[PDB]
Write a protein that binds this ligand. Structure first.
Ligand SMILES: N=C(N)c1ccc(C=O)cc1
Ligand SMILES: [Ca+2]
Length: 223
């Protein structure tokens, strides 16, 4: 997260870190057994780390649970990033409490202008590279589809939305991938892609979660 702020320990209780010997992606806990992330985060040997603030220090609220199964969206295209969504099942149910909690799925899509909270442990610099140890947060508005399409000609599908600031300086970044965009207590977005980070006229692009609620529910129901 570039141009954001320190969230505060366990203030984003649905935020997960995906770990394969090191943090490599975010995700969102949606019930005791399932995490939503980006398909471009897919790999084998994932350990889901819940209750994290400092990802390099055991602070006392963590739950580490190995993934039993990952399900990449049937229509994920890694070239265009269309349908950039994946479900991860935990080998055991997380113990839910105030610091480890699920986030609600939307019942309808969010509108341009809605303020949302974007979070993760990704790069904090728009030029160089600096990875934070503690969770970073950004409050950002959803942008109009027309401005999103204008920013990224020929690249924005109906499964994507832009959020952030066209002026630059405030954005998600590398390492935030797969993490949440939460608006009025609903998971509306997943950190997906962008041209660099926090660049002028290049806002963050996010997977449009409301399109996938039916798929998420039925997948969970049978797995
Ligand atoms: N919001 C962005 N600028 C952004 C988000 C994720 C990636 C993934 O590597 C790249 C750029
Ligand atoms: Ca920790």
């Amino acid at each position: 997260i570039v141009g954001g702020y320190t969230c505060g320990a366990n203030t984003v209780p649905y935020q997960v870190s995906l770990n394969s010997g090191y943090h490599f992606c975010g995700g969102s806990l949606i019930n005791s057994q399932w995490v939503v992330s980006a398909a471009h985060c897919y790999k084998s040997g994932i350990q889901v780390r819940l209750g994290e603030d400092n990802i390099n220090v055991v602070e006392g609220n963590e739950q580490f649970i190995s993934a039993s199964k990952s399900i990449v969206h049937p229509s994920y295209n890694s070239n265009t990033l269309n349908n950039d969504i994946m479900l991860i099942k935990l080998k055991s149910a997380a113990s839910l409490n105030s610091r480890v909690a699920s986030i609600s799925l939307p019942t309808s899509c969010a509108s341009a202008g809605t303020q949302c909270l974007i979070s993760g442990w990704g790069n904090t610099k728009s030029s160089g590279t600096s990875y934070p140890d503690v969770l970073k947060c950004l409050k950002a508005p959803i942008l109009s589809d027309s401005s999103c399409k204008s920013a990224y000609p020929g690249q924005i599908t109906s499964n994507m939305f832009c959020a952030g600031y066209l002026e630059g300086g405030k954005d998600s970044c590398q390492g935030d991938s797969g993490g949440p965009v939460v608006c009025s207590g609903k998971l509306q977005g997943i950190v997906s892609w962008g041209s660099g980070c926090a660049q002028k006229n290049k806002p963050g692009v996010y997977t449009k979660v409301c399109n996938y609620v039916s798929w998420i529910k039925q997948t969970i129901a049978s797995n």
